[PDB]
């Protein structure tokens, strides 16, 4: 149902529980998770998102999301 899959990342400040939270927030909210990124210095994840969830961590960005890459609202590939 989502608008597709997305890939967001969190700065190197965000907390651990926070990560699981934000992600969980999407799980409960709407978006889902299919994969995650537990790299050294890189804390991100990949899964299903939408335009709604975006605005969520889209505005608060900078102090939460380091990089956001939407692949749902692409159309015409």
From Swiss-Prot:
The keyword Kinase does not apply. Keywords: Acetylation, Protease inhibitor, Serine protease inhibitor. GO terms for molecular function: serine-type endopeptidase inhibitor activity. One of its GO terms (biological process) is vacuole fusion, non-autophagic. PANTHER family: PROTEASE B INHIBITOR 2. Belongs to the protease inhibitor I9 family. This is Serine proteinase inhibitor IA-1. It comes from Pleurotus ostreatus.
